[PDB]
Amino acid sequence: LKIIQDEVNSLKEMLVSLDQLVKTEIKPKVSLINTAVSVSIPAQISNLQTKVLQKLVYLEESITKQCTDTTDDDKVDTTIKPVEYYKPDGCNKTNDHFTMQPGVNFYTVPNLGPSSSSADECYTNPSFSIGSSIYMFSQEIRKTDCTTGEILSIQIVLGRIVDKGQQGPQASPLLVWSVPNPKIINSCAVAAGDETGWVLCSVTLTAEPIPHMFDGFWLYKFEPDTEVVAYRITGFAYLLDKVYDSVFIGKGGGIQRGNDLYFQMFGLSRNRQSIKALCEHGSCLGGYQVLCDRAVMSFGSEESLISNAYLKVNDVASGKPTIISQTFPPSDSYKGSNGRIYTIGERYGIYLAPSSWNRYLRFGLTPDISVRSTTWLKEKDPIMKVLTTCTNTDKDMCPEICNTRGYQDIFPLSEDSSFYTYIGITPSNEGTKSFVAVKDDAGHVASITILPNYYSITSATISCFMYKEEIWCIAVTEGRKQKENPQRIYAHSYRVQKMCFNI
Amino acid sequence: LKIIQDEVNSLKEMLVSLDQLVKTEIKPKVSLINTAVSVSIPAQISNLQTKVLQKLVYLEESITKQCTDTTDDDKVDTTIKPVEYYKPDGCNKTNDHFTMQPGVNFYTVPNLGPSSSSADECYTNPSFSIGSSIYMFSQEIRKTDCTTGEILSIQIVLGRIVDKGQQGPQASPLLVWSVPNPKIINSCAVAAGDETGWVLCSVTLTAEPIPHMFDGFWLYKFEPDTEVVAYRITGFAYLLDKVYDSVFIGKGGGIQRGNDLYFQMFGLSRNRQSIKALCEHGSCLGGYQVLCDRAVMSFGSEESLISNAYLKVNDVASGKPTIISQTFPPSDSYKGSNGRIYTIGERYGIYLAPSSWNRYLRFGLTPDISVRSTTWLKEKDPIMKVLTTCTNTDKDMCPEICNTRGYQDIFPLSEDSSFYTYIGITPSNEGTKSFVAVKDDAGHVASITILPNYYSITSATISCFMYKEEIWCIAVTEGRKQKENPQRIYAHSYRVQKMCFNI
Amino acid sequence: LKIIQDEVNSLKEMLVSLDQLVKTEIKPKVSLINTAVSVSIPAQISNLQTKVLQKLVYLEESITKQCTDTTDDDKVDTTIKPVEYYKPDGCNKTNDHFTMQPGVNFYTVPNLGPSSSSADECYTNPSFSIGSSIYMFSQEIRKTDCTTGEILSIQIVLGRIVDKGQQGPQASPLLVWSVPNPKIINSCAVAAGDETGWVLCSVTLTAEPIPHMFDGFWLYKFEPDTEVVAYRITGFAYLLDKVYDSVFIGKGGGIQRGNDLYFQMFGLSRNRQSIKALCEHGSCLGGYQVLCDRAVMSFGSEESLISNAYLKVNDVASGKPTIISQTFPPSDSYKGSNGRIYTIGERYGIYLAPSSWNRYLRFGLTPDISVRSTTWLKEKDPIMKVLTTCTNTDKDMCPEICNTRGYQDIFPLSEDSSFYTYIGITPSNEGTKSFVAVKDDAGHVASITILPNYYSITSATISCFMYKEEIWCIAVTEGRKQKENPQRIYAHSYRVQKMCFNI
Amino acid sequence: LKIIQDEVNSLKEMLVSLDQLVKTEIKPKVSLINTAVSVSIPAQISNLQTKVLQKLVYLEESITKQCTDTTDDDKVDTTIKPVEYYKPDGCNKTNDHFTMQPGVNFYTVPNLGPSSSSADECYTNPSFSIGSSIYMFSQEIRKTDCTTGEILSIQIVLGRIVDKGQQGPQASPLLVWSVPNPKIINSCAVAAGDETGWVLCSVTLTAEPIPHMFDGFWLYKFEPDTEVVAYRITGFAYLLDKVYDSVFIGKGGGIQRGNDLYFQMFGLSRNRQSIKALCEHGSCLGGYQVLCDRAVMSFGSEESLISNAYLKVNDVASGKPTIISQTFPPSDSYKGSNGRIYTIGERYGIYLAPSSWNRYLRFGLTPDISVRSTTWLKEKDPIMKVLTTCTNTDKDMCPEICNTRGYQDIFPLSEDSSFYTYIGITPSNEGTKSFVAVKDDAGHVASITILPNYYSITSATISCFMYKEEIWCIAVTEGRKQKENPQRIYAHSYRVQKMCFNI
Ligand SMILES: *[C@@H]1O[C@H](CO)[C@@H](O)[C@H](O)[C@H]1NC(C)=O
Ligand SMILES: *[C@@H]1O[C@H](CO)[C@@H](O)[C@H](O)[C@H]1NC(C)=O
């Protein structure tokens, strides 16, 4: 028996030595190689190409004629920049119209994140954000039913945007992570800054979880070639404006400004006051105001409303972050829904998806992130026409009790959001049809048809950046190639052209 | 004893942690690196080379004179395209003949798939197909005897065709897989489409297997960076036209059209009717018709015939595929054999290898995959002269009872198969001799000798594609370098030149 | 029980086989790949770029006009060279002043060595040295308190300086190692030569260690793709000039000359003689001499002084090295401190950091490494203004009892150190401010502000080399990006410009 | 106890699964990556460089003026070719002398094979051969004493010669292997052909081994990405001409011609006849003939001689090789020694190292590998002056009883070996001095000094090939950098220039 208690001890020493070898020598070197081949070499080849071709241009000029700063110094990878809006330089003449249009191509961006073949799995609720160099992506994997199924796993993919010699920008994953205990999460969303990514997840109560109940938040910090740091925000670490029974983090993601993070949230809150719901519609014909009020109530109850709010995460650098919210009144909003926080130069913007009877674009601008300073846009495009149970029309948009569960955001191409890019989706008898469009400040829309070989697309989120000194955008969508396929997440890219037309 | 039940439990935790590390971190990163070095970097360097050289061409033009679309957007890798047939543009003049000829080079394409040195192993029955970007390859590994030996393993190698700076196209393996329980498989064949590969295997009964008996099929789906999905097709999931005792899948492979797969099959079927076998021969001299009838019977039995059939796999996207066959009558065919399904523009073609007394090319064209719509070609070349026990001549091809076990297919270079490329093999007293040839529509054959340093080549299969805007072909053959070597699978490439001769 | 003693034995055989596979096949190949992607490929691409661009230059010259040695042969990597000082070629004219200035850029050099996110860890006491091709880096990781905390680990990173297509030189790690039993080390420092690195560590006594006691040294030899060789230097293997109770190795590092190594050391030594401390100051007004004497005493004791010494490691190639020291008298120095040994052509230099009341630059030159041959410079810049408890002024620098714990070295750009480069740090109410400067031989200083987005920088060490045929320097600093961050080590690079001004 | 017999079984399943994963997925992919980064990418970049630079040359020609085959098709890697001797094209004029000289550079070729830092290990007896694309290298590792120490291991390194953008050719290892049971091996040598390497080892008897006794041979076959195949040649599988008590394989290596291998061997053989030893010397003055006879006897015994022989390995492709030898008479040779077999066009050559009193070059040519057809050269250079106990002079070379244990071979640069390259070594009071030289057919020697920073070099072997269309040579030597270093194996390269001088 001593030899046994001895032989087992021998196995322990051999197993520990092997485990140390894999963690100490091999894992580190494999990570270094991944970066060298996926990021660094492509960057070196790209710089070579640019310099050689530019010299050849000077030779072309010479033959015909003779016959026959400080800002990028702290950057690791300078392939992309934050968006620098186009200006009408020289388009201030009589009858000379400055506009923007999408290009004719819609290129694939493969391997944005991992996937699978199992028909029992569904990929949904993508959250995508592009920072100054890096991108954050997150995808929920649910069992069978996509919307009401169990969460099997949430996957976060930190990576970089690089130039690989293709017609558009390409993704390069550096770190993939799987959130522990996914079964107790209501929702997660991402945010990104300078070489740092953030994830904020809202969690629930347990008895096995108790569905859509609220019990604080988790915050995760992601860095290149570094371990993930988790923080628990509970107890007195958070303060909500209204009392919430159920809290969700808005799908579209958040932003980082200085030492604070901003996210959009929505949820089910307690109410002890009468309301006058916002009720804007066309020439439909008292009854409509009643419907507008019942449209924001949970189960028709005067005391429990579904509403939107701003969520601020304070002082992240201290290691002990706190959360403070500010809620929108029912008089200046519609039934609470998934939204997104934008940074627009020195100003901010907010997108709120349709979820009720009003299917018009709801997007606002503000000098600071607060409720009382928000000014709403008067544009209508896009109108959400999919994943809805509403029977009203796109002209009058009359109030009724119905629901919508889609998401189609926009990306501002100017400081006042007078110009913007979006993807439209129209239902048909054979899946869906869709297009890319840019709306100008005169109300005109330039549009090009996309993805003719996909059975259906149900959603879209857009993030733009500078690449090769012009604006490029990446769109992430959910859909199916063939009618019988499970739902998967796809990504494509396109360019925005500057044009000026002499009328 | 508790410390033992404790020390063992400690080993379990350490072993699980190590296993998770290798599967979670290392395997994924190694796969990403393989793609980066074998596919992505080569693509980037190739694009650089093309752009720089083209600019230099413009400079050459400048000096002398002054003194002294939407289709590839959804593609991951655009190195190759489906074949675009050459047209006689400007060869419509009097006495001006449009033709095609092979080039003078026959380049090696190394590492198409893995191999071994053991003299106890034989590599045979290759199945090769090139899709829109990817290729599928499969090789059987048998013990000692090559044809009648036990199957040790079947290996499937999914990979891509890339440009590595060599004189021709090169292979780049991405995924290698070994079919489980190979001992119960009669045969497997491959098919490929757009980034998806398929494998169909016919299986037998068990008591240890019972030789050449039939018990349904297995279908496997292969995708890049994805797990392999297997389906069992048995019970009422398949319906055969005739009752078969033994079913084999044709070696040459199949195609994918829309949501269906098409394969060629052959096997031993029950018969209750009299027959009049197809019996076409030259000026040999009642007795011949009798021999032609007994040539298609198993063991001379009127009731059991060996015949060919089309095999269709219906609705693969549903996850629950079914199989339906359609059998060729004995009056329009010869003893059943290994064949191949071709896609020729909007039309289809079928190749049937010689297996009996008739050794002439048997190839047909059809508007749809059915028996009654097939029209057979009247060309003879190539004539199979190897691996045969027949003693007839190449002129009269007189009926007798004999067998042939080779395979030499062709690849159409025009919609009506009036032009095509093939490899001829002629036996000698020192292994074999062979050549590459292209037959034109006037019946002329251009040919170039190949592989002068190989003792023998016994078979060949050809797949063609566009590369660097001209047609290139890859030939996969079985053979031996030196007389005493075991049989191995080799691959080489060549180009097809466009020529027009003013007579 | 036999089956158990048998099943365990089976596990042993399987575990040994697996461990051998990882050590024999995989580890070696991973190391070879790391070099190929991080060093060899970048070198090949860089050489291509240079040759192509130079040819294009000749074409530019041709168009306009016609219209419209043996020294690097033994080198593995020729990207960098030892510094070749600039000369005033053609600046010997009347009113024509030869000078040197820093460039305007300060580029990031990422991944010089590994790091971490834990807030409980602090990275301090960096030691950095650049050899003929390779570099040595070492960083101490302490728990919580940075200066008085426990040592958790010391990490040594041997690597190479390479060209990766960026604006400046970049680091490429080859070997990372962790010194065993870090808890018994007083301090470590690095040195580097031709493809060989060295580390010298001073160790203490144990009872758990006994704080700042002395018990000999360890020497480690580092080579590329090779195991680390350790030597113990104790007993009669070392001889110190004075009797030391506590010995530390100077932070800045040492040099290799022929078969010997030279390091700076300092420590607490026994004294039986009266002293007259060096006491140089300005127009402050007997009392000052008394303060100057008590400033070099430990706890005010006449018998125990803190002093500097040279440390020589003799005959390293024999495998049995020995150590001999030579101590500086209190009459020609100040309280002992961290320093650095320099090689300046055929001559040597020594830097001694401020640690007491005198905060002016203390740097000397010598024809050989000995105390009696050292001649001190009369320059003042830089003056250390951070990490000090002194209340004197930068003009008079009056004696008092105080302490300083910073480190800001210089790098000579000429044989007589009449020109040199340094980094200045000035404290403010919001962390610190800093700049890069080059002082010329007329006493003028050219300076450029750096790192505007870093809350604070507390130290700097500079190493220079030739790159792309001009002098480039890498500065390694300790600091924080945001006020609440833990301390981390950062590295940046800049260039030194040659200028000549016609007055 | 059942739970124990159960928990152990669980560990077995987990360990087997992990072992299969590492062998099935990871090992294969790592090997593919090594080739991609070390061989394939460098080849692609090199081809780019050549094509771009050649176009630029044509542009240079254009500006000034206008103003201001089938043989490599079967090759995997075409970087190098077998030597094509230079011809005096246009040097057939009066007073116009055709010659060859070495270049001035002697470049390092790093990582030819692995090494170590342990001072207890010595690397000796290198065997190096270059084939049509690949190279074979083998190094013995002995404990402490280098010549009489125990063999710890023999390491074989199969690799390729590639272009990495450096001034000369570089090595790229693909497969490293360690011969099992090295303790029973007398000696090993390598040979190489077309993508196949061979190793032949002579083994001894065991009681623990019995020193220098003979018991047959082992043959190993090495192929890229393939397992090593071993064969035992014993019993009646070999037949030696004379009866040998002890057999060694000549250090320099062998060749492959068709299906046979040729090696040089030497050993201790039985003798029953009187002898008349070859005794060629200068004007020294019966006694000398007696010394010449005793110089070839073992321990002075008439019945036991030390002699050379040819060793042929017959029919390697069959898998059952046999060995037949043919011995040189004492009347046409000197004491047996290490030699080398050369292929010189259609003819063969043999090199025999000095081992006795005659220290002049001994090299012969033959139309076939046999004793009776060998014709010896009359050149003297090089004369071996190191590792000898002889006291005779380089002029008369008088017979005595002494021994020499060096090795300095030559490489023919012409069909008749009238031109050749060699490395000379001259002893001094400070290690050794050496040079590279080329001897022409007029007896003139061009020489250049090498390795000025190496304490000593004791041996050299040379293999030449075509690279960038001119002859390049790699020399492998044994030596020490610093006096106190252990012996290690180094490799360097140089070029042979074609010159023609008008007198
Ligand atoms: C050949 O076809 C071209 C059109 O592709 C036509 O322009 C030309 O006239 C035709 N030539 C003859 C001889 O028919
Ligand atoms: C040298 O040989 C060339 C042929 O290679 C021949 O044309 C020439 O005339 C010869 N010159 C002399 C002097 O023989």
- Name, in order, each residue with C-beta under 8 angstroms of D464's C-beta and a sequence gap of 6 or more: D83, D130, D411, D413, D421, D471, D472, D473, D474, D496
CA–CA min distance D429, chain B (Å): 52
Contact D457, D451 (CB under 8 A): yes
Going from the Cα of D92 to the center of ligand 2, the distance in angstroms, rounded, reads 6
Q: Where are the strands (E) in D250-353, listed by range?
A: 255-257, 260-270, 304-314, 322-327, 339-344, 347-352
Q: Helix, strand or coil for residue A167? A: coil
Burial A15-45 (b: 16+ CB within 10 A, else e): beebeebbeebbbbbbbbbbbbbbbbbbbbb
d(CA D295, CA C371): 63
Quickly count: other Cβ atoms within 10 Å of residue A437's Cβ: 18
Alpha-carbon distance values, B411 to B104, B350, B415, D33 (Å) = 19, 11, 11, 34
D95 Cβ below 6 A of ligand 2 = no
B92 Cβ below 6 A of ligand 1 = yes
**Which residues sit opposite A463 in a β-bridge?**
A474
Q: Helix, strand or coil for residue A355? A: coil
SS3 content of chain A, % helix, strand, coil (to 5): 15, 40, 40
Q: Helix, strand or coil for residue C31? A: helix
β pairing state of D238-239 and D322-327? parallel
Residue of D16, D105, D117 with shortest CB distance to C73: D105
d(CA B276, CA B256): 34
**Which residues sit opposite D459 in a β-bridge?**
D407, D478
What technique solved it? Answer: cryo-EM
- Name, in order, each residue with C-beta under 8 angstroms of B76's C-beta and a sequence gap of 6 or more: A108, A110, B133, B195
**Which residues sit opposite A441 in a β-bridge?**
none
Q: Whose CA is nearest to atom 14 of ligand 1?
A: B92
d(CA A110, CA B421): 36
**How many CA atoms lie within 13 Å of D403's alpha carbon, on the beta-carbon side?**
8
d(CA C341, CA C48): 38
CA–CA min distance A5, chain B (Å): 6
Compute the CA torsion angle B154, B158, B163, B166 (nearest 10 deg).
-10
Q: Helix, strand or coil for residue A125? A: strand
The ligand whose atoms approach the alpha carbon of B87 most closely is 1
B93 Cβ below 6 A of ligand 1 = yes
Burial A272-291 (b: 16+ CB within 10 A, else e): eeeeebbbebeeeeeeeeee
With CA atoms as reference, the chain C residue closest to A60 would be: C60
Placement of tokens 């040595």 in the chain: C136
Q: Which of A433, A427, A432, A421 is nearest to A461 (CA)?
A: A421
Packing angle between helix D27-35 and helix C27-35, nearest 10 degrees?
A: 30
DSSP per residue over B318-353, as a string?
GS--EEEEEEPPGGG--S---EEEEEETTEEEEEE-
Q: Enumerate neighbours of D (3 or more CB pairs within 8 A).
A: B, C
Alpha-carbon distance values, B66 to B60, D61, D67, D68 (Å) = 10, 15, 9, 13
Distance, first Cα to last Cα, chain D: 97
Contacts of A62 in chain B (CB under 8 A): none
With CA atoms as reference, the chain D residue closest to C317 would be: D484
Q: Whose CA is nearest to atom 11 of ligand 2?
A: D92
β pairing state of D107-108 and D488-502? antiparallel
Would you state the structure tokens that stand for residue D25, as one six-digit string? 């997925």
Give the 3-state secondary structure of D21-41.
HHHHHHHHHHHHHHHHHHHHH
Run of H or E residues at A433? strand A432-439
Alpha-carbon distance values, B366 to B325, B372, B416 (Å) = 17, 9, 10
Run of H or E residues at B57? helix B41-66
Would you state the structure tokens that stand for residue B118, as one six-digit string? 């053991």
Diameter over CA atoms, chain A: 100
Q: Ligand 2 atom closest to Cα of D91? A: 1
Q: Is D71 exposed, middle or buried (0-12, 13-18, 19+ CB in 10 A)?
A: exposed
Contact A186, A248 (CB under 8 A): yes
d(CA D251, CA D459): 12
Q: What is the resolution of this structure in A?
A: 3.2
Inter-chain residue contact B104 with D21, CB threshold 8 Å = no
Q: How many residues does chain C have?
A: 503
Going from the Cα of C4 to the center of ligand 1, the distance in angstroms, rounded, reads 88
- Name, in order, each residue with C-beta under 8 angstroms of D158's C-beta and a sequence gap of 6 or more: D134, D135, D136, D173, D174, D175, D176, D177, D197, D222, D224
Q: How many residues does chain D have?
A: 503
**Which residues sit opposite D123 in a β-bridge?**
D141
Q: Helix, strand or coil for residue A274? A: coil
B54 Cβ below 6 A of ligand 1 = no
Diameter over CA atoms, chain D: 100
d(CA B139, CA B127): 7
Question: Rg for chain D (alpha carbons), in Å?
Answer: 25
DSSP per residue over B2-46, as a string?
HHHHHHHHHHHHHHHHHHHHIIIIIHHHHHHHHHIIIIIHHHHHH
Alpha-carbon distance values, C324 to A315, C193, C338 (Å) = 54, 21, 19
B345: left (phi over 0), alpha (psi -120 to 50) or beta: left
d(CA C64, CA C59): 9
Contact B188, B154 (CB under 8 A): yes
SS3 content of chain B, % helix, strand, coil (to 5): 15, 40, 40
Whether the ω angle into residue B211 lies within 30 degrees of 0, i.e. cis, is: no
Q: Ligand 1 atom closest to Cα of B91? A: 1
d(CA C385, CA C396): 14
With CA atoms as reference, the chain D residue closest to B166 would be: D44
Would you state the structure tokens that stand for residue D308, as one six-digit string? 């050379």
d(CA C218, CA C230): 7
d(CA D365, CA D374): 6
d(CA C478, CA D160): 45
Q: Helix, strand or coil for residue B447? A: strand
d(CA A169, CA A465): 10
The ligand whose atoms approach the alpha carbon of B91 most closely is 1
Q: Where are the strands (E) in A235-372, listed by range?
A: 238-239, 244-249, 255-257, 260-270, 304-314, 322-327, 339-344, 347-352, 362-366
D87 Cβ below 6 A of ligand 2 = no
β pairing state of D445-449 and C488-502? unpaired
Q: Whose CA is nearest to atom 6 of ligand 2?
A: D90
d(CA B190, CA B134): 12
With CA atoms as reference, the chain A residue closest to C21 would be: A18
- Give the amino acid at B103: G
d(CA C79, CA D177): 33
- Give the amino acid at D264: Q
Contacts of D225 in chain B (CB under 8 A): 111, 114-115
d(CA D451, CA B245): 78
Q: Which of A324, A356, A323 is nearest to A337 (CA)?
A: A356
Inter-chain residue contact B53 with D58, CB threshold 8 Å = no
Would you state the structure tokens that stand for residue D35, as one six-digit string? 């080739």
Residue of A18, A58, A62 with shortest CB distance to C18: A18
Please give the angle made by the CA atoms of C489, C495 and C498, to the nearest 5 degrees: 155
Q: How many helices (H) and strands (E) does chain B have?
A: 4, 29
Contacts of D23 in chain C (CB under 8 A): 21
d(CA A414, CA A423): 17
Q: Helix, strand or coil for residue A309? A: strand
With CA atoms as reference, the chain C residue closest to D104 would be: C70
CA–CA min distance B73, chain D (Å): 26
Q: Which of D44, C161, B145 is nearest to A45 (CA)?
A: D44
Going from the Cα of D414 to the center of ligand 2, the distance in angstroms, rounded, reads 20
Inter-chain residue contact A30 with B33, CB threshold 8 Å = yes
d(CA B42, CA B47): 9
Contact B25, A146 (CB under 8 A): no
Q: Whose CA is nearest to atom 5 of ligand 2?
A: D89
Run of H or E residues at C411? strand C410-412
d(CA A393, CA A357): 10
d(CA B383, CA B392): 12
Q: Helix, strand or coil for residue C265? A: strand
Ligand 2: residue of D92, D95, D97, D502 to mutate (most ligand atoms within 8 A of CB) is D92
